[PDB]
């Protein structure tokens, strides 16, 4: 409840030449080319900076705007403008929905969902769990990852592989999930954080898809007509035949549980 503070006083400048003899900068694709491809998963250099909400979050100029996005750099912890910044420096909360196209972290979501599951999810599929990989020190991997992940958001499921350093924390919301993905990359618990793949478990897929229907039901029940909503519980918490006579006085679901002009309910009152 205090103004947000700047993390990095300096600006990290770009000057670096890999493989001193055999690399040359490429002007079109702004990256060094030539030389040994080198392990695809070797460049990963542990991140230097790290952030926590407690000592860093606070007010910023973006809190005023209702549709403002979070700092791409607060989560990774090099937002060097502090409260002057144009993005929120606080943590996503439960009701921080954004549009489907836009990434909840301020970026944009493509459709191909990549191949190495690297940067940003796809709007075509709705997943809240992300692969985190890296160190496999001892059996206390479960507790260390729980400690290092719960402070980024609300958690629904954690599954950690004992044999190898693989964990699959599942978040409740897209906002917290993607914030954690961008906040736990190249950090110390370097972590190889990626997006999760479709479950091959016939049992896990069923419960995930059931979760999808319950999220849909929570979304839609605010839109269905009031009569349908109330009758849903009147049938389950009261007798049924006592009102069919009133219905028989004036009997299908689509005919009766329907809105729009010239419907029976509008016609019944106007008679």
């Amino acid at each position: 409840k205090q103004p947000a503070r700047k993390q990095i006083e300096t600006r990290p400048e770009y000057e670096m030449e890999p493989e001193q003899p055999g690399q040359v900068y490429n002007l079109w694709y702004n990256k060094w080319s030539g030389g040994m491809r080198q392990d695809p998963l070797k460049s990963q250099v542990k991140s230097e900076t790290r952030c926590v909400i407690s000592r860093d979050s606070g007010y910023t100029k973006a809190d005023k705007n209702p549709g403002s996005f979070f700092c791409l750099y607060f989560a990774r912890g090099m937002c060097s403008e502090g409260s002057k910044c144009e993005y929120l420096h606080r943590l996503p909360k439960d009701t921080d929905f954004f549009n489907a196209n836009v990434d909840c972290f301020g970026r944009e979501k493509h459709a191909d969902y990549r191949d190495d599951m690297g940067g940003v999810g796809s709007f075509l599929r709705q997943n809240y769990t992300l692969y985190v990989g890296g160190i496999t020190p001892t059996d206390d991997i479960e507790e260390i990852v729980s400690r290092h992940f719960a402070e980024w958001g609300d958690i629904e499921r954690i599954r950690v592989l004992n044999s190898r350093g693989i964990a699959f924390i599942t978040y409740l919301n897209e906002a917290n999930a993607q914030f954690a993905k961008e906040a736990m990359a190249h950090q110390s618990l370097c972590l190889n954080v990626r997006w999760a793949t479709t479950d091959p478990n016939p049992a896990s897929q069923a419960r995930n898809q059931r979760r999808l229907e319950e999220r849909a039901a929570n979304a839609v029940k605010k839109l269905l007509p009031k009569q349908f909503l109330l009758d849903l519980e009147e049938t389950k918490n009261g007798k049924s035949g006592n009102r069919k006579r009133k219905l028989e006085l004036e009997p299908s679901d689509d005919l009766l549980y329907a809105d729009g002009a010239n419907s029976v309910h509008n016609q019944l009152a106007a008679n």
Partner: protein, 154 residues
């Protein structure tokens, strides 16, 4: 009072309720006698609600009775839409009945108001049940023309 309707899907037979509503049935009877219902499209077909038709224009509007523009509807208590096949009239106001009519496909108890009931389909109900499955575009209108080849009254 009895009228056959030679429709594309099949054969439709209607017995008129002359004893209940005489004025609104004589026009239909003599109208089949004149028989300009030839080549008239059932412009409106709604799954489980109605099959409306009877306008020479075919645009869902028009239709001239023997009186010429409209007339008065007569309704009394014992008439109900309790079944699927009651042959009733189409109107657009208090007393605005025209030459066009419709056939009921499901109990419409709410509709026993401003609509005149003057028929029951004794034979050919299967034809109406099939008409309920006709390809229909976005509006309540069949894509192919569901013309009435002939309407012979007997």
């Amino acid at each position: 009072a009895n009228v056959e309707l030679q429709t594309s899907l099949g054969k439709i037979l209607i017995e008129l309720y002359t004893e209940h509503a005489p004025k609104t049935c004589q026009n239909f009877y003599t109208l089949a006698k004149e028989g300009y219902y030839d080549g008239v499209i059932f412009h409106r077909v709604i799954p489980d609600f109605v099959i409306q038709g009877g306008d020479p224009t075919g645009t869902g509007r028009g239709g001239t009775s023997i009186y010429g523009d409209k007339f008065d509807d007569e309704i009394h208590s014992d008439l109900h839409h309790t079944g699927a096949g009651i042959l009733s009239m189409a109107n657009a106001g208090p007393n605005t009945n025209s030459s066009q009519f419709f056939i009921t496909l499901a109990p419409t108890p709410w509709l026993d108001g401003k609509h005149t009931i003057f028929g029951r389909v004794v034979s050919g109900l299967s034809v109406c049940k099939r008409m309920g499955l006709i390809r229909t575009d976005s509006s309540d209108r069949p894509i192919e023309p569901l013309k009435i080849i002939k309407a012979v009254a007997l």
